Amino acid sequence: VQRIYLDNNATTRIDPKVKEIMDPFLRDHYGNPSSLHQFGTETHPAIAEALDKLYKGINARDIDDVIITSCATESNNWVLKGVYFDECLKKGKNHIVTTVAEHPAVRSTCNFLESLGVEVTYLPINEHGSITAEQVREAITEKTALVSVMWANNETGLIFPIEEIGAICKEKGVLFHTDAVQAIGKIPVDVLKANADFLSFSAHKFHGPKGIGGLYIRSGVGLTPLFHGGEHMNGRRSGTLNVPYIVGMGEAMKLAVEHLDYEKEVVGKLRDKLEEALLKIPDVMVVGDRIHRVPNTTLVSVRGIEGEAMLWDLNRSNIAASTGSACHTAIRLSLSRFNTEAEIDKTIEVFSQAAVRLRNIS
Amino acid sequence: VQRIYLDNNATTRIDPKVKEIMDPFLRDHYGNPSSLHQFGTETHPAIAEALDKLYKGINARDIDDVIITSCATESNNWVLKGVYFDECLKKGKNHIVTTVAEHPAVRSTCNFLESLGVEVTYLPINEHGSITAEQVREAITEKTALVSVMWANNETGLIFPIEEIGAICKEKGVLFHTDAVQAIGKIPVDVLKANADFLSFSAHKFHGPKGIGGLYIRSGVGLTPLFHGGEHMNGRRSGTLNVPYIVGMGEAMKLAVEHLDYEKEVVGKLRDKLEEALLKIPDVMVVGDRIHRVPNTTLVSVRGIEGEAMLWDLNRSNIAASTGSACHTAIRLSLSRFNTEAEIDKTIEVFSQAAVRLRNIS
Ligand SMILES: [Cl-]
Ligand SMILES: [Cl-]
Numbered sequence: 001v002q003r004i005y006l007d008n009n010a011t012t013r014i015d016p017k018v019k020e021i022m023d024p025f026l027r028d029h030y031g032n033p034s035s036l037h038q039f040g041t042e043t044h045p046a047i048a049e050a051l052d053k054l055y056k057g058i059n060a061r062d063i064d065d066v067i068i069t070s071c072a073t074e075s076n077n078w079v080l081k082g083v084y085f086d087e088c089l090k091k092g093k094n095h096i097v098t099t100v101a102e103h104p105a106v107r108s109t110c111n112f113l114e115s116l117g118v119e120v121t122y123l124p125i126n127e128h129g130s131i132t133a134e135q136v137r138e139a140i141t142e143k144t145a146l147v148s149v150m151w152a153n154n155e156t157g158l159i160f161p162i163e164e165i166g167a168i169c170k171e172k173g174v175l176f177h178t179d180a181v182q183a184i185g186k187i188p189v190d191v192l193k194a195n196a197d198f199l200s201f202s203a204h205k206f207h208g209p210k211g212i213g214g215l216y217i218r219s220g221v222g223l224t225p226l227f228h229g230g231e232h233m234n235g236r237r238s239g240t241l242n243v244p245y246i247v248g249m250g251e252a253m254k255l256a257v258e259h260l261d262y263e264k265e266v267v268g269k270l271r272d273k274l275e276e277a278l279l280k281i282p283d284v285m286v287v288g289d290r291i292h293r294v295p296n297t298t299l300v301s302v303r304g305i306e307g308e309a310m311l312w313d314l315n316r317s318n319i320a321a322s323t324g325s326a327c328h329t330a331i332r333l334s335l336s337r338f339n340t341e342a343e344i345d346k347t348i349e350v351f352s353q354a355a356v357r358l359r360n361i362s
Numbered sequence: 363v364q365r366i367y368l369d370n371n372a373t374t375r376i377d378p379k380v381k382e383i384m385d386p387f388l389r390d391h392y393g394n395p396s397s398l399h400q401f402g403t404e405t406h407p408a409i410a411e412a413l414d415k416l417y418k419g420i421n422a423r424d425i426d427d428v429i430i431t432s433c434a435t436e437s438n439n440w441v442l443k444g445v446y447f448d449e450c451l452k453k454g455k456n457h458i459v460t461t462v463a464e465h466p467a468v469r470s471t472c473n474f475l476e477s478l479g480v481e482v483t484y485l486p487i488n489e490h491g492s493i494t495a496e497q498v499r500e501a502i503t504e505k506t507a508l509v510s511v512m513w514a515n516n517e518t519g520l521i522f523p524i525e526e527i528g529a530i531c532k533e534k535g536v537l538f539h540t541d542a543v544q545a546i547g548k549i550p551v552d553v554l555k556a557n558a559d560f561l562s563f564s565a566h567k568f569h570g571p572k573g574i575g576g577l578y579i580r581s582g583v584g585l586t587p588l589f590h591g592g593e594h595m596n597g598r599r600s601g602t603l604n605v606p607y608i609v610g611m612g613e614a615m616k617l618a619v620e621h622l623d624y625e626k627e628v629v630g631k632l633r634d635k636l637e638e639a640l641l642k643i644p645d646v647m648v649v650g651d652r653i654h655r656v657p658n659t660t661l662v663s664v665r666g667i668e669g670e671a672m673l674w675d676l677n678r679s680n681i682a683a684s685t686g687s688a689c690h691t692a693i694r695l696s697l698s699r700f701n702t703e704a705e706i707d708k709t710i711e712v713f714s715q716a717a718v719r720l721r722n723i724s
Contacts, residue, residue, distance in 0.1 A: 032372045074589060105601070
């Protein structure tokens with residue numbers, strides 16, 4: 001059997017290099033980095049290297065923090081809850097502005113916040129499949145504590161106008177947070193250019209392990225711990241370091257950065273090829289703008305014949321993809337560095353055949 | 363070189379079996395358990411097995427939850443913050459009772475809570491090195507939302523009277539939480555007998571990886587998510603599952619349970635041997651009760667000559683141990699299934715020599 005994996009915005013294969021780098025931390029270097037003795041100390045250099053890699057990946061400065069978390073969900077929670085504590089309860093700034101596009105980790109948190117009496121305004125998506133970059137301005141009520149926009153959408157692949165929201169944030173004096181989970185390894189990420197106070201990411205979206213993430217926190221910006229215990233991560237996030245995962249994550253980030261051109265030029269090309277092939281079939285059209293999208297994602301909708309059925313069919317032939325809400329759900333196909341032209345060709349063939357079968361059934 | 367590791371209450375070696383069990387989830391079974399297709403589904407059985415193992419380990423019922431977290435720190439935070447939301451803000455029960463012995467993950471959280479206007483009373487430790495099991499009763503003000511006692515102390519090894527605090531909790535109608543981090547693999551743990559509503563644990567204390575933990579939550583007991591997103595873990599704790607770690611943790615728990623007799627009979631014996639050897643030296647005495655202690659831990663204090671220096675000396679000879687506050691810090695030596703009689707003998711010799719050297723210096 002040969003399976004084809006097209007669900008990369010859902011999770012990704014760990015890179016063999018990442019695995020290799022992690023291995024000795026599962027085996028002999030198992031000491032607690034907080035310990036004083038040779039085990040803990042032994043862990044330091046590797047950890048430092050990992051951190052450096054992470055920093056380079058998002059163009060963070062020495063003065064900034066990139067705090068290791070257990071996942072981007074965690075990061076999101078920390079950002080929102082932290083801002084509620086600091087800026088909402090204690091400074092009366094009882095408004096947050098986000099988008100409707102945001103990952104449930106944000107949206108759900110926001111809902112919870114609202115249930116405590118926070119006002120949250122969720123910017124409606126337009127026909128272009130974006131936020132105007134101005135709706136924010138139109139909604140910064142000064143009582144706004146935080147603005148939170150995802151860098152790229154997980155369903156559509158669509159890139160939002162970060163950088164221009166950063167300006168609208170700097171001008172307005174409001175805290176800016178970008179969940180960047182689906183940006184890493186896909187497009188350049190620059191926290192400086194973004195004027196982000198907070199950035200989220202998760203390793204498993206760029207060939208690291210599940211179960212680890214980052215929150216970038218800008219110098220001098222404060223955020224009340226979500227994990228109190230104050231022993232690790234400069235007091236900001238307590239809990240014994242996940243050494244293996246840290247190392248792996250660092251490596252993954254490095255690899256992601258290295259493959260940016262490749263992602264653009266080759267993965268993107270593959271995606272385009274797939275998309276074009278698909279569109280030469282009855283009443284199947286891409287959902288959203290096709291220009292401001294990360295290179296790896298296509299979301300496509302088949303006339304009548306629903307998405308779930310299609311997905312099931314694909315699975316039956318060993319091809320893995322996901323749904324994406326579009327308004328009938330659509331079909332989300334998300335490539336990686338590891339797909340090949342051959343695979344794409346096969347997918348196209350299989351997709352067409354599946355469509356025809358479903359068509360026949362209809 | 364041959365090093366000797368006596369810092370197990372700080373973190374533990376991953377068991378080779380655990381490593382083995384995790385490996386295929388780092389390699390080919392890398393799909394997201396939430397996905398519908400063959401990758402996600404493929405992950406199910408293993409996950410189920412892991413969960414079963416976990417459940418068996420703490421004598422939880424089908425009706426209960428054992429929620430996967432990123433660490434016991436996380437668990438602690440979730441318990442405390444959750445109870446504040448549910449029971450403190452919304453039901454006016456603005457009191458929590460804990461001990462001074464508790465891990466900083468609890469204590470720090472409590473401090474934070476207090477800073478919001480929660481009243482928290484921290485039970486003072488006695489000369490026996492325990493909580494009376496009655497101080498709790500004496501302090502349950504009905505307005506008590508939660509009682510939180512660690513099952514065993516990380517510094518002394520001392521077991522607290524859980525089960526008798528459970529009764530005092532059931533009788534009083536108050537939520538009971540036990541951080542059990544240092545109990546797993548050391549002594550039997552039974553959430554039924556404990557009448558726990560909440561139990562915490564962390565994998566790396568029983569030969570699992572760092573970066574994963576559990577919170578047991580009793581049937582029908584509610585706790586507001588610390589990670590909102592409500593996609594995983596029956597809505598209670600969002601974030602893509604750490605599949606590898608989950609599997610590993612399950613295995614580790616199983617192994618821990620299996621080795622309970624061994625821990626008692628053999629590890630305990632080793633510890634005793636060490637302790638006796640040490641005590642036959644000028645003005646060196648064990649800190650605390652020597653009867654109600656987990657089998658693996660001894661905390662010992664050398665007249666005058668401080669603990670840190672001793673630790674450093676030990677490290678220089680390839681022997682790793684930790685401090686433990688005692689009142690001059692004391693010396694904490696914590697064995698595992700992997701230490702040998704030979705190693706113990708060597709340690710004894712080395713310890714004595716080190717003492718004499720320091721004595722000479724004095
Ligand atoms: Cl918080
Ligand atoms: Cl919470």
